[PDB]
Design an enzyme around this catalytic site. Structure first.
Site, mmCIF file in Angstrom:
data_model
loop_
_atom_site.group_PDB
_atom_site.id
_atom_site.type_symbol
_atom_site.label_atom_id
_atom_site.label_comp_id
_atom_site.label_asym_id
_atom_site.label_seq_id
_atom_site.Cartn_x
_atom_site.Cartn_y
_atom_site.Cartn_z
ATOM 1 N N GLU A 1 -40.984 13.372 27.285
ATOM 2 C CA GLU A 1 -40.813 11.940 27.068
ATOM 3 C C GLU A 1 -42.141 11.203 27.185
ATOM 4 O OE1 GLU A 1 -38.789 10.091 30.266
ATOM 5 O OE2 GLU A 1 -39.698 8.160 29.763
ATOM 6 N N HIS A 2 -43.001 11.640 28.106
ATOM 7 C CA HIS A 2 -44.276 10.965 28.314
ATOM 8 C C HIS A 2 -45.153 11.034 27.071
ATOM 9 C CE1 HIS A 2 -46.257 9.356 32.096
ATOM 10 N NE2 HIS A 2 -44.964 9.228 32.342
ATOM 11 N N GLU B 1 -48.342 8.909 38.374
ATOM 12 C CA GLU B 1 -47.039 8.255 38.355
ATOM 13 C C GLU B 1 -46.194 8.687 39.541
ATOM 14 O OE1 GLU B 1 -45.977 5.830 36.667
ATOM 15 O OE2 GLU B 1 -47.406 5.698 35.008
#
Ligand code: HEM
Ligand code: HEM
Lengths: 379, 79, 435, 51, 60, 101
Positions: free
Chosen positions: C59-60, C136
């Site tokens: 997804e990143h 993150e």
């Protein structure tokens, strides 16, 4: 550094209970009796203990042991009559304390009031058994009548009575039971009194005006320690008058004859502090109804907080309620007097009317009068 | 709990006092107490006394009636 | 028009299926804008300990470049249209959606296809995203609610894939290589496990033919709930976070409807709420009056065959116990004595939540995609209202007794949680001696 | 006590009446067992063997 | 199929009031059974040494 | 009504709180509603009430009374607390009625 009186645990408890306790500044002498009660209790223990060092709870030796206390023991008569009259002083202070609670609306302290009712019942039981202890004619026959009252309970009365008696009637078993219970109960009373003060200190004490006194509070120690010492001195004066000039004033002569199970004394009445209840018991011809009325006569204190309908707490500002309260006090005096008197023509009807008036005043007249006063004050 | 530090909020109230060693313990004890005692008695007498007066009347009547009842009735021995 | 008439007039969701299994769903609403997205039935729970971060990693770097639009070009194209491209991935679903003018429906769909199928994972881009994801994680630590919910998932579903966090361990992030990500995409980004949803100005036939144009070239373990606790004692933190849950039902279980009502009865509170002591929820009123809680909220997090049903609150050091008490008491009330008026209020709250959450093209698209992934169908608001109307006090009591009364909970604490009651005490609180 | 004279309290009672009845039975069985009433224990099939 | 223990919890142990009733009824039956069993054991051990075992000779 | 006014004045005089300088609302029993009403009183009224109550307590401590001309007059007695207490009781009644539903 710190202050020991404020930091040490036991010192913390004692300081918060009796030294730095915020107390209302306007509480009158009627607030002394509480402390007086404690003193009586302590006395009733100390004196009582020194009676147990010579008393033997056997039917063949109980009366002889009492005569030995009052005849041979050094200052034994002082101790014995201090005990006997101190019981009466205890009940005088109890009645005055309950009257103070009723008058100044102190029953709004619900938990304190309920613990007080429990204390009253416990003290009455203790005094009853203690009076049974000497095993005179009065002791034996008063115990017989009072315990036989329990036989009116339906379907368990006989079994309960014979279990308490320890046999078929009041005998040596019952005497020893009563000695043990009479010895042990005052310590339960002390524990209940500790709980009572614990509940009272949760909200502080009331005052004659019936208005919260947080704006005017004083340290309990410097003022009320000396005030309670003076009150205790006056109570001790009255008690010592009764013990050194009329030691047999509040007693009955027929209790100086050894118990005779085969011969009732000329008159069978309990001690004066029970007479009122006795009177109520004699108003109802039915045995079960009489017992229920006797129990309700003391249980009405439980209903007292719920019956309070006035907007004001104390009776200090309610003249009609004051008149009702004094009528109630005169009625209680009438009930005591009749309980003393025999069961004959005028006494029966006056006692019935007095019991009816007692229950009517406590239940009906007082709430209605309080509502009338509320309407007169426009609220 | 309830401690002298925090019981209520009060403002602008001034209390003047005196040392016990600078004032008399019984100041005007009689000349002020006796009128004050009379005032309190006058206030409370009409509220307290009447029930006890009624009780005394009932007590006297009951004692008299009981004593009369114990007395002999001549009419029972007419024959 | 009345509420029922308004419900019946809601436009229906049209669903079709491609020949490769892709489900194309749309809700036209005649608006200039429209949302179009792809919801993939792939997530953390489909990953093992070897690749626990594959989904989040993919997804990143989904938007960082494709085989047809290398590097930043893709982004520029989206930005040229004024469209907003967003993505997320939970423990069970992944989603890539675009908000754009309806006139830009074709291009957007094309872009989505390129994002889903022809994703190019450049090694330099992979390393950049690896560093980004590590930072993150270090930032995610700061977020207390996310940490406490991850702890709740870890302890409740221990030994099962659901215990794994979405992001995965930092060691797993460092180990993940291009081969692992490619294998994950090939296994999970498959047509039968994806839904192309759209709402707004889209027309179903247009969306369907676009999907057939772009998406045709596409490939053709019940978890165990465990009553346990994780306590991360850290007195340096200002407030204590607690999250207590019990085993809930799945998506398909009808009992989800009354249970939400039950939660609506418990309600939510925050220190910034203006309701204060007058809040209908007794727990909210107590929290406002006694200052017991900065913010508490009940949650019903459903999964395919299980779920977490409970509450999460933030409290002072000296308040946790009390709050827990009241919270548990509330549950017990619903299990034993639930009245009709509060159930009606909870039903109204649930109806309002259902109708309000579906305001906007993006919420409607998210609802369509998630419903097709979980329920296999789009539940119309009329059916939701019928299910809610079926709920009454007796149903609430029965369902709460089934799921709450005398059940072993999973507890997650974080911060100054010294006052957090012992698990035996909490378990004892999960039942009433009077009942 | 008109505060409790409402529909909710009527519903509240009905929810707790079965529970209160069950606790009453526990008290009844406990009293019979503790006191060995034998007015009631005579009916009990196996307990009546005693006395 | 639920086990016996599962049946016991669902029917009797789930609600405390029913839990109390099970204990109360159980205590009634347990006392009679336990006393009867314990008396049998004691009387069997001391067989012929108790009055109840030798009264017949002297009774009547 | 004139007889009612007369008997009300007589009872006000008989209830001796005016002899202490108090007002009618000072003697009210402080239950929860009264406590809330006192907490809602404006500062000047609260301070006046506190001082009047303290002065009454001081008078009752010494078993003395206020001078004849300082007694609160029946016609100038102000029911300062009554509106606040009425509002508090109304609010409590509303909450109880809501709870009844
Ligand atoms: C509230 C506490 C008590 C009350 C109200 C109370 C009351 C009484 C009364 C009225 C008597 C009858 C005395 C007589 O008529 O001659 C008595 C006797 C007696 N009490 Fe108590 N008593 C209390 C505490 C105690 C305690 C704490 C003890 C022992 C530790 C005790 C031991 C005795 C004894 C031995 C007698 C018989 C001696 C005698 O009658 O002279 N009492 N009590
Ligand atoms: C052995 C029996 C008792 C003991 C040792 C005892 C002790 C005390 C003491 C030391 C106080 C504080 C002084 C005072 O406020 O006067 C007190 C207050 C009080 N007692 Fe008792 N007491 C007894 C019996 C009772 C009974 C029989 C009642 C009621 C039926 C009662 C109800 C109260 C109440 C309401 C207060 C608070 C009075 C107020 O704050 O205005 N107590 N008690």
């Amino acid at each position: 550094m710190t202050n020991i009186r404020k930091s040490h645990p036991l010192m913390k408890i004692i300081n918060n209970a009796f030294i730095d306790l915020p107390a209302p500044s306007n509480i009158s002498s009627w607030w002394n009796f509480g402390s007086l009660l404690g003193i009586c209790l302590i006395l009733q223990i100390l004196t009582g203990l020194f009676l147990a060092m010579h008393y033997t709870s056997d039917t063949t030796t109980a009366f002889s042991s009492v005569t030995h206390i009052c005849r041979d023991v050094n200052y034994g008569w002082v101790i014995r009559y201090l005990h006997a009259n101190g019981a009466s002083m205890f009940f005088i202070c109890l009645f005055i304390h309950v009257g103070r609670g009723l008058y100044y609306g102190s029953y709004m302290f619900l938990e304190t009031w309920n613990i007080g009712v429990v204390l009253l019942f416990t003290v009455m039981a203790t005094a009853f058994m203690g009076y049974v202890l000497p095993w005179g004619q009065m002791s034996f026959w008063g115990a017989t009548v009072i315990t036989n009252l329990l036989s009116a309970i339906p379907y368990i009365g006989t079994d309960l009575v014979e279990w308490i008696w320890g046999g078929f009637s009041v005998d040596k078993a019952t005497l020893t039971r009563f000695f043990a219970f009479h010895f042990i109960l005052p310590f339960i009373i002390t524990a209940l009194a500790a709980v009572h003060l614990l509940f009272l200190h949760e909200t502080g004490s009331n005052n004659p005006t019936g208005i919260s006194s947080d704006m005017d509070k004083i340290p309990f120690h410097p003022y009320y320690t000396i005030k309670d010492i003076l009150g205790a001195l006056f109570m001790m004066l009255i008690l010592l008058i009764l013990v050194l000039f009329s030691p047999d004033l509040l007693g009955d002569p027929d209790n100086y004859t050894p118990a005779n199970p085969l011969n009732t004394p000329p008159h069978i009445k309990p001690e004066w502090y029970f007479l009122f209840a006795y009177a109520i018991l004699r108003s109802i011809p039915n045995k079960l109804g009489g017992v229920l009325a006797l129990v309700a006569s003391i249980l009405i204190l439980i209903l007292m907080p719920m019956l309070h309908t006035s907007k004001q707490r104390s009776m200090m500002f309610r003249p009609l309620s004051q008149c009702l309260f004094w009528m109630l006090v005169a009625d209680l005096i009438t009930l005591t007097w009749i309980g003393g008197q025999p069961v004959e023509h005028p006494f029966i009807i006056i006692g019935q009317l007095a019991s009816i008036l007692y229950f009517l005043i406590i239940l009906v007249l007082m709430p209605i009068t309080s509502i009338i006063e509320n309407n007169l004050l426009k609220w | 709990g309830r401690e002298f530090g925090h019981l209520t909020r009060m403002r602008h109230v001034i209390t003047y006092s005196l040392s016990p060693f600078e004032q008399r313990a019984f100041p005007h004890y009689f000349t002020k107490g006796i009128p004050n005692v009379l005032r309190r008695t006058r206030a409370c007498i009409l509220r307290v006394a009447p029930p006890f007066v009624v009780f005394y009347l009932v007590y006297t009547w009951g004692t008299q009636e009981f004593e009369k009842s114990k007395r002999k009735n001549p009419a029972a021995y007419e024959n | 028009a009345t509420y029922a008439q308004a419900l019946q007039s809601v436009p229906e969701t049209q669903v079709s299926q491609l020949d490769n299994g892709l489900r194309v769903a749309s809700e036209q609403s005649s608006q200039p804008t429209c949302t179009v997205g792809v919801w993939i039935d792939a997530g953390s729970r489909y990953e093992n300990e070897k690749n626990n971060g594959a989904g989040y990693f993919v997804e990143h770097l989904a938007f960082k470049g494709t085989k047809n639009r290398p590097g930043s070009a893709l982004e520029k194209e989206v930005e040229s249209m004024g469209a907003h491209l967003n993505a997320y991935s939970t423990r069970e679903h992944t989603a890539y959606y675009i908000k754009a003018l309806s006139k830009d429906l074709p291009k957007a769909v094309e872009l989505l296809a390129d994002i889903v199928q022809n994703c190019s994972l450049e090694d330099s881009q992979i390393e950049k995203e690896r560093d980004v994801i590590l930072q993150e994680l270090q930032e995610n630590d700061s977020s207390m609610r996310d940490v406490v919910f991850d702890y709740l998932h870890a302890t409740a579903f221990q030994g099962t894939p659901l215990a794994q966090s979405v992001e995965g361990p930092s060691e797993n992030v460092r180990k993940l290589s291009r081969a692992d990500l490619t294998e994950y995409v090939s296994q999970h980004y498959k047509a039968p496990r994806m839904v192309l949803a759209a709402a707004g100005g889209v027309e179903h036939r247009q969306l369907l033919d676009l999907a057939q144009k772009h998406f045709s070239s596409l490939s053709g373990t019940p978890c165990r709930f465990t009553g346990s606790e994780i306590r991360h004692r850290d007195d340096a933190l200002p407030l204590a976070h607690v999250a207590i849950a019990v085993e809930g039902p799945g998506w398909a279980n009808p009992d989800n409807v009354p249970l939400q009502v039950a939660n609506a009865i418990i309600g939510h509170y925050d220190s910034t709420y203006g309701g204060g002591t007058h809040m209908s929820s007794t727990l909210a009123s107590v929290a406002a009056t006694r200052k017991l809680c900065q913010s508490f909220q009940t949650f019903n997090i459903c999964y395919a065959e299980t779920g977490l049903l409970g509450a999460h609150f933030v409290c002072d050091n000296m308040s946790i116990d009390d709050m827990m008490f009241f919270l548990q008491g509330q549950w017990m009330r619903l299990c034993t004595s639930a009245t009709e008026s509060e159930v009606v209020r909870g039903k109204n709250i649930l109806r309002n939540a259902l109708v309000s959450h579906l305001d906007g093209t993006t919420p409607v698209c998210e609802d369509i995609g998630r419903s097709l992934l979980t329920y296999g169908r789009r539940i119309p608001l009329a059916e939701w209202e019928s299910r809610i109307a079926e709920v009454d006090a007796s149903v609430v009591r029965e369902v709460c007794s089934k799921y709450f009364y005398d059940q072993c909970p999973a507890v997650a604490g974080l911060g100054p949680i010294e006052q957090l009651p012992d698990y035996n005490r909490i378990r004892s609180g999960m039942f009433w001696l009077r009942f | 006590l008109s505060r409790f004279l409402g529909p909710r309290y009527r519903e509240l009672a009905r929810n707790w009446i079965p529970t209160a009845s069950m606790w009453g039975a526990v008290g009844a069985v406990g009293l019979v067992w503790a006191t060995d009433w034998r007015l009631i224990l005579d009916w009990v099939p196996y307990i009546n063997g005693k006395f | 199929a639920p086990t016996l223990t599962a049946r016991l919890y669902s029917l009797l142990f789930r609600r405390t009031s029913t839990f109390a009733l099970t204990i109360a009824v159980g205590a009634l039956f347990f006392e009679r059974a336990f006393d009867q069993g314990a008396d049998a054991i004691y009387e069997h051990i001391n067989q012929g040494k108790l009055w109840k075992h030798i009264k017949h000779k002297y009774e009547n | 009504s004139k007889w009612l006014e007369g008997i009300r004045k007589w009872y006000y005089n008989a209830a001796g709180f005016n002899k202490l300088g108090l007002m009618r609302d000072d003697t009210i029993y402080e239950d929860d509603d009264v406590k809330e009403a006192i907490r809602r009183l404006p500062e000047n009224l609260y301070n006046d009430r506190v001082f009047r109550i303290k002065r009454a307590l001081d008078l009752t401590m010494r078993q003395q009374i206020l001078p004849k001309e300082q007694w609160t007059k029946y016609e100038e007695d102000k029911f300062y607390l009554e509106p606040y207490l009425k509002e508090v009781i109304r609010e409590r009644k509303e909450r109880e009625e809501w709870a009844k539903k």
